Amino acid sequence: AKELDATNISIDKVVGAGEFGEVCSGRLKLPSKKEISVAIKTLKVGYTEKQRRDFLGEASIMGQFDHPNIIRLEGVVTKSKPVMIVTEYMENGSLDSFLRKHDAQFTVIQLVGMLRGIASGMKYLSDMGYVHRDLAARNILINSNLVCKVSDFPIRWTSPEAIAYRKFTSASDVWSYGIVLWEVMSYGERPYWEMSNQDVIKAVDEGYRLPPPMDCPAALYQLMLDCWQKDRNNRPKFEQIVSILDKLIRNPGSLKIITPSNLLLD
Ligand SMILES: COc1cccc(-n2c(N)c(C(N)=O)c3nc4ccccc4nc32)c1
């Protein structure tokens, strides 16, 4: 993490509440004098040394990644207070809340573009040996041009083997990605709705899966089912997912084929 000079940071408005303090939007002046929009997280006054370590830990992890679909760390402020993390700004906020405002208003190709971006970011994360463990639409940010980026460095999003015995792998992230795919095509519906956690676990283990979202292309529902294979070795790798979505983008016509209990037994 680059140490930023605090005189280069302006804080304009509060846009959210974080675990360790406020989230704000603002501006950062780069060494080149270019001014960019940024998000700013501040560590709350009177922090404990553990809180400081956990706070800055996110920056340490995020700083290892340089990719168009991973939130960009601009730097940190530690030598003055409040302590701060500064990232690129994403005008349209969290993906799930954004889609909920626009139910059925985007084209399939727009949605597939979002999904391809998320998959590309995950492909790089997994390439780097990072298992996210919290991949969910609420942890994806989306900017003014609808570019989606992985952020946040959860039973409904977690693979059965990770729930069963903490077997977290890039293949359990692929499971989570399948859930994100369902979330996106459902415009931010909650996975498994408000089912009791114990029933989500039992149903999924028994082979039940989320149903196809309204007007969901068959190709995309099949990709969900592939991400949700019980045997994690049968799930696609993220490189394959990116390839699949790139084909659908290249062949928009294929997206026109559309797909007892709420959940379906696969
Ligand atoms: C500045 O440090 C970080 C680290 C991780 C995520 C974010 N982060 C951003 N870059 C955001 C943005 N809109 O650009 C944003 N909106 C948020 C809204 C609500 C809660 C947390 C948020 N968190 C946010 C900011």
UniProtKB/TrEMBL annotation:
Every Protein kinase domain range: 9-249
Function: Receptor tyrosine kinase which binds promiscuously membrane-bound ephrin family ligands residing on adjacent cells, leading to contact-dependent bidirectional signaling into neighboring cells. The signaling pathway downstream of the receptor is referred to as forward signaling while the signaling pathway downstream of the ephrin ligand is referred to as reverse signaling. Highly promiscuous for ephrin-A ligands it binds preferentially EFNA5. Upon activation by EFNA5 regulates cell-cell adhesion, cytoskeletal organization and cell migration.
Primary gene name: EPHA3
Record: active site: 134
Keyword Glycoprotein attributed: yes
Key words of the record: ATP-binding, Cell membrane, Disulfide bond, Glycoprotein, Kinase, Membrane, Nucleotide-binding, Phosphoprotein, Receptor, Repeat, Signal, Transferase, Transmembrane, Transmembrane helix, Tyrosine-protein kinase
Subcellular location: Cell membrane
Record flagged with keyword Acetylation: no
Single annotated GO MF: ephrin receptor activity
Name used for this protein in its record: Ephrin type-A receptor 3
UniProt: ATP binding residues: 15-23, 41
GO cellular component: plasma membrane
Main location: membrane
